[PDB]
Design a protein around this ligand. Sequence first.
Ligand SMILES: C[C@](O)(C(=O)O)[C@H](CC(=O)O)C(=O)O
Ligand code: SF4
Length: 753
Amino acid sequence: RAKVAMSHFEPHEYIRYDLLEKNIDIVRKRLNRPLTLSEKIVYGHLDDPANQEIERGKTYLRLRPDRVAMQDATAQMAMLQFISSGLPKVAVPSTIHCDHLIEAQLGGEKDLRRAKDINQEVYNFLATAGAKYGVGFWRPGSGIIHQIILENYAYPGVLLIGTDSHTPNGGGLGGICIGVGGADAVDVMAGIPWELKCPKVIGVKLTGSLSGWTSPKDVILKVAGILTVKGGTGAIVEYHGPGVDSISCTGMATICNMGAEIGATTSVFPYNHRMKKYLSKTGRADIANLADEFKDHLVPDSGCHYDQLIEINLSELKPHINGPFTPDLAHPVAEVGSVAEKEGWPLDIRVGLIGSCTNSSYEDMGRSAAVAKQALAHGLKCKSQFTITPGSEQIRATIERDGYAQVLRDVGGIVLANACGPCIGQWDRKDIKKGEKNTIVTSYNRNFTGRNDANPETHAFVTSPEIVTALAIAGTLKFNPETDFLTGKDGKKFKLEAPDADELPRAEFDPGQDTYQHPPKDSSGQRVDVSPTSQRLQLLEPFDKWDGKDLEDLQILIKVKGKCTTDHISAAGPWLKFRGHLDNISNNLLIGAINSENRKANSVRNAVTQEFGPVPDTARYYKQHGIRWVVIGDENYGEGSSREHSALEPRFLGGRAIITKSFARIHETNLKKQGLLPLTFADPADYNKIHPVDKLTIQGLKDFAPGKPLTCIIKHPNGTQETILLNHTFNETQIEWFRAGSALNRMKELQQK
Ligand SMILES: C[C@](O)(C(=O)O)[C@H](CC(=O)O)C(=O)O
Ligand code: SF4
């Protein structure tokens, strides 16, 4: 066909749209109905399109992804599992991005130099394991994983998986990009089919066009408020309608990115002329030309059916700000000042932060510079502290060149390294004491308790970068950029004009400094060294195979009340230091979850000693003494980040099952991957039948089967027993992971030994 390479770094790996077309056509001859765009790209990547059972929301699809991307906080454990497999080389194009371990403190270059010293051992391990197994390596300072992928690797029709829940960002260039845990990434790197539950499809029809202060971020802040954090579970969100051509390619990536906060499997936009333009300005005009020849397969079929349809008229959409606490608590910027006042949320903004993968594009930086230049023209600077995170080295070099970084420094901002930084709590914040109630506004995406600075009382609101800039200049939530007046230096009241700026540089992008390291795919004689006394890296010892018996008289470690995110289960911030060391990071297990017994975090009753203490310590005591335990949770358990450490840590400390009213998708898969039993109540009111003091027996593991519930006997202390039924979503592939002790153990059994 055409021989167009997948990227500039893999000149010999060609885009297979011929394959995509062939598979789409086998499938539509079987289904005889129009296909949505996400169905075309997902079913076009089936391992066996002729025989695959296809029912939305019901069957597990066996898929062949085109490439794997990892960032350094999840790559360590994905590579330690790949090293246990014993396999010599990765089977698909794979990259590691070093963006999560650079702490914001002094700003830019200074923080990057310090991170390279402090994290030497880890950057070393990832670069060496990358060279050995054939994984491309983007060095610290290169940029945030998703901005590097949009700029270099995402293209229309790609199926990409990434070990990060904001991998959907790549949907802004028409590809299906899905967040997974490290063991799912090991499957694909090892060459075995990846399984995904066939998604439902929510269609969002965009009408009109954005104007004034409204930006792409407002579309997904509105959709999150409508669908809520659990409304997208099990579905792909597919944006369509005439309003789509009104949004820039990076704007579309912003909207797909934050679809992770409603639990969506991913989000996607159809290939159009704004994506073409972006591909050409990022050196990929040949890929835009080939996608023009396969365009019919890169847009939805006429008359395709969405399981749910939402319509948003972009011309009536006004600026939003969401939070504090949850990303679906949506408010117009015009009313947040009065709601804050009413709810007792601090009105004064201590810090304004722009960037993160969600909003760190060239257009985002130009729109923020456009607000800031107006303030400067009246002799003002930010009243709040103000930080700017460029998404990649190319964006940092280009906004530096085109003058936007200096405008942002002149209003009082500090430019941080091209890294996650304050977005996952890698921030040496000293302006508030811990426990001090305060408000920060960001252009990020999640705003869960203690995620940016480990202070539970920080009220974090997420909005667009131009509104963070306007509010940082005013210093208060009680400021609406569209209506209100600031007073300049000269005494005159003035109003901010709505920002206007170019979507892409007129000139070319300046690539900045060299940051990619290609694998020698010749030589590869690397020894990966993991010191046996390291506190940051530790090789894995395989989990135990199932004993063949039912699980009797299980102790409840904790019955959790309410929201239980993967940041509650395995916190980030300071704990990122131990992401390659399973025993050391397991000391954060469930320390943020609220115990229903006392409503406290990290205080559970030890059943033997009858002392209340830390959850990690209590789980290790039970494991030392042979007491097998269970976690009981509420709705949407495991919401958020994809970190498989939330599943590895309960397995390591002796847990056996997690029983909840419902699971977020990625965490439920990660639990199954690690040999645990994720089970849901067949009747959710049964959550109220179980008391912290009860022992539980799970029966029927011997004839464990797809679609057959398991029986749970609740043993009450007074002698009463009650039987309830528990549902599971295991298929036979997955029951094999459980019987082997983990998916990695099963894979190693298939290697004939
Ligand atoms: C840090 C993270 O990027 C996050 O935003 O929560 C994570 C991955 C991780 O825990 O390392 C995510 O979204 O999956
Ligand atoms: S959401 Fe924040 S922490 Fe996750 S990749 Fe993006 S910038 Fe990094």
